[PDB]
Design a binder for these strands. Sequence first.
DNA 1: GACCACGGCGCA
DNA 2: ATGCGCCGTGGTC
Length: 534
Amino acid sequence: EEAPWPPPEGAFVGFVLSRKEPMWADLLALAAARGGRVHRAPEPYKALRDLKEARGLLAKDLSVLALREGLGLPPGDDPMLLAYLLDPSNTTPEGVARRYGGEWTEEAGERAALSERLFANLWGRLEGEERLLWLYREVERPLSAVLAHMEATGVRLDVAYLRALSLEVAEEIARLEAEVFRLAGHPFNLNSRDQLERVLFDELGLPAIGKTEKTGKRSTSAAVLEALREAHPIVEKILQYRELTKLKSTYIDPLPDLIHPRTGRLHTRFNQTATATGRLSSSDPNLQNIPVRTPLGQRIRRAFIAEEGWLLVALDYSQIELRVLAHLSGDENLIRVFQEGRDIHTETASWMFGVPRELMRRAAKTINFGVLYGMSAHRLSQELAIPYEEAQAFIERYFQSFPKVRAWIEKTLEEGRRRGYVETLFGRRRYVPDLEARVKSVREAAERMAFNMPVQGTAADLMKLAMVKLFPRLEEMGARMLLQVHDELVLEAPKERAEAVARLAKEVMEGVYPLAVPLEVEVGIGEDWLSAKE
DNA sequence: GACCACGGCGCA
DNA sequence: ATGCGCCGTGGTC
Ligand SMILES: Nc1ncnc2c1ncn2[C@H]1CC[C@@H](COP(=O)(O)OP(=O)(O)OP(=O)(O)O)O1
Ligand SMILES: [Mg+2]
Ligand code: NA
Ligand code: NA
Ligand code: NA
Ligand code: NA
């Protein structure tokens, strides 16, 4: 079925890259398949100009590359998106191909023919599934195009700043290390958890708290060291060393080396079919886990800056998962809190009775989260420095204040056992087979994954939809969408329009989809990521 | 050179 | 006793 290039319109494209990252890859081959007929392009780059849309497996990748080359080529249909909506465990072409009667190879033609077959088989599986079809048409397909532009745009990084920070951090690392060696009486590789384990529990007299999952080594995790804070002066220094070496090795050092030559900016990949809940993920580099919670983290956030003459706009959905929970469960007390414009964490702790709003909120905050994950009392203790007794109680009072949440959890599990899957507000599905496992530990783990999904997944849907609606508006205002961090959006705007952009973006996000409770958005504007988050 | 399992930890 | 992706160590091929 070999015909000369070019191919008819609407043909499924197949491409081969020298590496997985579209912004860094050489385009090795380009082929298209239509009516079982395969066309292979003599010169991939030149041939790119003939396409008016990228339709096929991993379409966003080819689109990102086209944008890199100055071509306005939009991603279209992608069988990966259909498969992922059918079952979120469909995360790769290799896995998908197998499951649905194909073979993911390394040739552009075969890949183009794989795309065709796969789209047929998957689309047919989606007839009658009108809610998934809605997700595909109204969210995932348009979203892929938005993500393609975010990836091609990238974000500006202050390299000189990071270079200087690295040298300072290094100095502090050496001092902590030297001190650790002093307390240990001898040098050793502090980055080796095995060597550290012997030092702490064999050479020093320190008690071993917990063991590691796979190999049963005496754990040296932060949880363990924290609980060992005042059993010996050395552990305190090890925690500081760990924080500093984590951020230096993971962010401070690698990021400056990843700046693209043409753009002078940092380009991440927004993976659209990689999670079980419907969230995006970010990789190569991951810009969804840039530090922020510690002073040194905040200093790292400062490295992310606006282009000169522009500003960063950062928008954050307040407590979106709790709000989704209020809607899903219908809990009146919970809904009331939000509709009255109250702050749940300050309200939730108010039910340490006798205080409308005086007491630490980070406890009520720790609790609310613990509810989302199925956290047990024993965990609240370590995560609150509170005796096991006062933890188990804190949890019971919660389900008294918010009864319908428990009812919703129970109902979600029961339905999940029935149908074999649970679903988001919009109908996104996750299959959770182990709900009927006969080992309690396995069964209950499955239950936590099961009831968390509708909460995490609805919040993901709301944000995705918000991005879809917001993107066209930004273009008209001459603004850029840069990053998404699950419940946050980071935009780039010309200094003069930043304020106007902030108003608009905020409103679009808050109105994305009216629920039983309002969606509130914190918005900030600044020269860098740190100052943009108020 | 590439890849692996593990423990560990950054963010939502 | 939620969801990700990346790091160094210790290791194979
Ligand atoms: N330590 C932690 N453990 C688990 N999940 C966490 C977490 N920190 C954040 N998350 C996830 C779970 C939900 C989300 C919470 O985001 P915020 O941290 O900003 O807390 P918010 O609800 O906004 O309270 P406010 O900011 O008003 O004090 O991030
Ligand atoms: Mg917040
Ligand atoms: Na499955
Ligand atoms: Na990509
Ligand atoms: Na997955
Ligand atoms: Na990688």
